[PDB]
Design a protein around this ligand. Structure first.
Ligand SMILES: [Cl-]
Length: 142
């Protein structure tokens, strides 16, 4: 139809030894970016699936960004998807998240970890989908 975006609220925090990972929402959309920096569109029959997430260092020492837990979009056949780093970057600027990130998070510091996937729309729309955190939690979004 004329519906450009469909949203799935999660709004849950998941505890891992070093980080509390919050998953805010998953968004199905036709494009990412800003008019100033240009827009990106997925190719025919595909959509961008955006998983908005963030991690908070809950230890008393700085921890490396490399240790942030994995957050993956997973289908009913257990295929876990790899984020499109370019689309994710456009989506980040789109949201005003424009600042190089640091290599470590400080104690109590929060770091955005938005993922953007390019998925077949029919597959996304007709199947069951989940967000898997640290290969430890499985949250069904649809
Ligand atoms: Cl805690």
């Amino acid at each position: 139809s004329k519906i450009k975006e469909k949203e799935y609220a999660v709004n849950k925090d998941f505890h891992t030894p070093k980080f509390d990972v919050t998953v805010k929402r998953v968004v199905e959309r036709d494009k990412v970016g800003k008019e100033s920096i240009g827009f990106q569109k997925p190719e025919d029959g595909h959509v961008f699936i955006v998983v908005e997430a963030e991690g908070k260092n809950i230890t008393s020492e700085p921890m490396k960004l490399a240790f942030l837990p994995s957050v993956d979009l997973v289908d009913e056949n257990d295929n876990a998807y790899q984020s499109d780093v370019w689309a994710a970057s456009s989506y980040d600027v789109e949201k005003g998240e424009t600042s190089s990130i640091t290599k470590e998070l400080k104690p109590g510091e929060v770091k955005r970890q938005n993922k953007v996937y390019v998925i077949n729309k029919e597959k996304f729309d007709t199947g069951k989908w989940y967000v898997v955190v640290n290969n430890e939690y499985k949250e069904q979004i649809k």
